[PDB]
Design a protein around this motif. Structure first.
Motif, short mmCIF file in Angstrom:
data_model
loop_
_atom_site.label_atom_id
_atom_site.label_comp_id
_atom_site.label_asym_id
_atom_site.label_seq_id
_atom_site.Cartn_x
_atom_site.Cartn_y
_atom_site.Cartn_z
N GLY A 1 49.76 1.57 18.45
CA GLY A 1 50.44 2.84 18.59
C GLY A 1 51.86 2.77 18.08
N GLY A 2 52.57 3.89 18.21
CA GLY A 2 53.93 3.94 17.69
C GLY A 2 53.98 3.65 16.20
N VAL A 3 55.07 3.01 15.78
CA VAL A 3 55.23 2.62 14.38
C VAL A 3 54.02 1.83 13.90
N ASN B 1 66.34 11.24 9.39
CA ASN B 1 65.28 11.74 10.26
C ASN B 1 64.01 11.79 9.42
N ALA B 2 63.12 10.82 9.62
CA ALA B 2 61.92 10.71 8.79
C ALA B 2 60.88 9.87 9.51
N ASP B 3 59.62 10.12 9.17
CA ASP B 3 58.50 9.28 9.56
C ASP B 3 58.42 8.11 8.59
N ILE B 4 58.54 6.88 9.10
CA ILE B 4 58.55 5.70 8.24
C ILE B 4 57.31 5.65 7.36
N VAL B 5 56.18 6.15 7.85
CA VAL B 5 54.95 6.14 7.07
C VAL B 5 55.09 7.02 5.84
N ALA C 1 63.08 0.52 7.42
CA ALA C 1 62.80 0.04 8.76
C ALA C 1 62.88 1.14 9.81
N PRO C 2 62.18 0.96 10.93
CA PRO C 2 62.43 1.76 12.13
C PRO C 2 63.51 1.06 12.95
N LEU C 3 63.99 1.75 13.97
CA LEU C 3 64.72 1.03 15.01
C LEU C 3 63.76 0.09 15.72
N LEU C 4 64.30 -1.02 16.23
CA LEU C 4 63.49 -1.99 16.96
C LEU C 4 63.74 -1.89 18.46
N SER C 5 62.68 -2.18 19.21
CA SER C 5 62.66 -2.23 20.67
C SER C 5 62.74 -0.86 21.35
N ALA C 6 62.95 0.21 20.58
CA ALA C 6 62.89 1.54 21.17
C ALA C 6 61.44 2.03 21.12
N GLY C 7 61.23 3.34 21.07
CA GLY C 7 59.86 3.82 21.08
C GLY C 7 59.13 3.29 22.29
N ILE C 8 57.87 2.88 22.09
CA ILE C 8 57.04 2.44 23.21
C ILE C 8 57.47 1.10 23.78
N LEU D 1 67.09 3.20 7.61
CA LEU D 1 66.43 3.46 8.88
C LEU D 1 65.81 4.84 8.91
N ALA D 2 64.51 4.89 9.21
CA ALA D 2 63.78 6.13 9.40
C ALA D 2 63.61 6.37 10.90
N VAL D 3 64.20 7.46 11.39
CA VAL D 3 64.18 7.83 12.81
C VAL D 3 63.22 9.00 12.98
N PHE D 4 62.16 8.78 13.76
CA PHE D 4 61.06 9.74 13.85
C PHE D 4 61.47 11.02 14.56
N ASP D 5 62.24 10.92 15.65
CA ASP D 5 62.55 12.06 16.50
C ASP D 5 63.86 12.72 16.09
#
Ligand SMILES: OC[C@@H]1CCCN1c1ncnc2[nH]ccc12
Ligand SMILES: [Cl-]
Length: 167
Positions: free
Chosen positions: A45-47, A18-22, A122-129, A151-155
């Protein structure tokens, strides 16, 4: 041994936090950070918007030159550009946008780009916005990527659900 810390191991090669990729990128300065890009490399926006903001818009300036030379990426495709102050390289990967009617099967093609790099943040792909279900995105990731992916998952809510439903 690498400098990533605090990750839960999901499989031989997939790790999650659980982390912000930035924030992860600034701390770790990995060799490759993945951007959840669109075909125009418009990092709004998003990632993408968050990564670009952290580069003081240098990512967008570089991306606009890339598009002017090469034209848009394919859905499912990628390009390697600079990682600026966040990483050595940024792998811009385009997952399908379900809100645009794009084929979710292209998510596997998107994740295949990760296999060209030995280790990635990396983030997950195709999720988020982009509209897809993150639970599905994680499964495709695990079943497609063979190189070492962090994988860094924001939420936090989502991270807990991804972990609990995994095995
Ligand atoms: O599926 C991508 C998820 C859901 C929407 C945003 N996103 C992020 N993931 C990881 N780090 C992030 N930093 C800023 C945004 C962000
Ligand atoms: Cl996003």
């Amino acid at each position: 041994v690498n400098s990533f810390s605090g990750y839960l191991k999901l499989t031989d090669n997939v790790y999650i936090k659980n982390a912000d990729i930035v924030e992860e990128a600034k701390k770790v300065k990995p060799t490759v950070v993945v951007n959840a890009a669109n075909v125009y490399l418009k990092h709004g926006g998003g990632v993408a918007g968050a990564l670009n903001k952290a580069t003081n818009n240098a990512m967008q300036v570089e991306s606009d030159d890339y598009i002017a030379t090469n034209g848009p990426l394919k859905v499912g495709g990628s390009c390697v550009l600079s990682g600026h102050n966040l990483a050595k390289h940024c792998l811009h990967v385009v997952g399908p946008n379900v809100n645009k009617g794009e084929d979710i099967q292209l998510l596997k093609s998107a994740y295949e780009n990760f296999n060209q790099h030995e280790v990635l943040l990396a983030p997950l792909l195709s999720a988020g916005i982009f509209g897809a279900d993150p639970i599905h995105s994680l499964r495709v990731c695990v079943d497609t990527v063979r190189t070492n992916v962090y994988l860094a998952v924001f939420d936090k809510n989502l991270y807990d659900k991804l972990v609990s439903s995994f095995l």
